[PDB]
Please model this.
Amino acid sequence: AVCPDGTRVSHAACCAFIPLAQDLQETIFQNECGEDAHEVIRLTFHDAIAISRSQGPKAGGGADGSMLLFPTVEPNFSANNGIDDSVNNLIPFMQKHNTISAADLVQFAGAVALSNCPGAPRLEFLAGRPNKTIAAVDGLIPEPQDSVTKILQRFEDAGGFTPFEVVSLLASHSVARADKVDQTIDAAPFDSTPFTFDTQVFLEVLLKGVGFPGSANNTGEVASPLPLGSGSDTGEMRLQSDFALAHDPRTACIWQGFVNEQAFMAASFRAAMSKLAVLGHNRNSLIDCSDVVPVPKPATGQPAMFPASTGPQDLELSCPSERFPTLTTQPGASQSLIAHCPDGSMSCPGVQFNGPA
Ligand code: HEM
Ligand SMILES: *[C@@H]1O[C@H](CO)[C@@H](O[C@@H]2O[C@H](CO)[C@@H](O)[C@H](O)[C@H]2NC(C)=O)[C@H](O)[C@H]1NC(C)=O
Ligand SMILES: *[C@H]1O[C@H](CO)[C@@H](O)[C@H](O)[C@@H]1O
Ligand SMILES: [Ca+2]
Ligand SMILES: [Ca+2]
Model:
């Protein structure tokens, strides 16, 4: 089909997603893998994973836009702390781009945001999820204090995900920060390149922790290898769950297997997101609108490297059957600050709309 702007696409129903991507980029992402991008990518996961095979449909409808349609329910569960900003940022698009369901809006916005992170894959994007659902029940969202057994069970109950798929989805912690885990600091990144969809998080979680970016007693947190921060350049945070996954026998070799394996990580993440994005639906009932997902920013192609102040002697390895790769170390004797902003500064405020969440 030919869309009103002249774009030739796969199916006419995909046309509306073109001005929606443009509006999302101009209004809240500005083609950056920044704060607003980060928040929407986390929303795609919290929207989608609130579903349970064992409890039945009444517990949640999966990737169904329930966070936007019932903005006062799920966003207020304690495990969803901080999700309110992303919901309030997307509700104005749901109202304006009113031929696209809330559910499709959430998934597509996540795809658009990810395309702004260098190295990310171009997600599949299927369309057609209905615009009506129910609010999910509490307890469906994994939490960073949870054990690996609990986490793996939640993902298996939610949609059959294997441990490989679970760690695959956690490549999203390559472009991720924490505002709520420690209330004294904001925007504590999970790797040293939170604007770049690279394998650094897999490497860095395997380094011995030496301190905390804020306080030392937060639930769900463990010591960080790069805790130094200054001004708004908050030090690296480590989640207990990421640490646990990197060392548990079920997932340790999978975790290590992504270190310095960019294309493998990105392809694996795309495969797992293809499953996540259609939870609560039959994929044979959704139309393929992948050609309207923006093409992602390419990686530079550089190998993973130890950040300065760290090196191979700091590794805490847990996979007996796979050799840890030979990596170089960035020069310098002390840690570099992790930039608060994509262009290197500390001043880059994200557009935020007020809203009901
Ligand atoms: C065991 C699984 C997971 C747990 C327990 C976990 C936990 C967390 C925590 C606690 C935060 C910090 C929020 C805050 O305090 O501000 C967060 C951030 C984030 N998570 Fe996860 N998550 C996991 C899986 C996922 C998955 C599968 C994705 C998406 C595919 C995702 C993407 C992100 C993103 C993008 C952020 C950054 C949000 C921002 O910077 O504002 N996470 N995660
Ligand atoms: C999906 O459901 C939402 C919520 O009912 C609809 O949102 C309304 O959209 C109109 C414009 O069509 C606005 O005037 C309302 O203010 C919106 N409601 C709320 C509570 O925000 C949306 O239109 C529906 N989209 C589709 C594709 O049916
Ligand atoms: C980042 O900053 C540290 C100093 O804090 C250096 O050691 C490193 O080489 C990089 O310039
Ligand atoms: Ca949902
Ligand atoms: Ca990164």
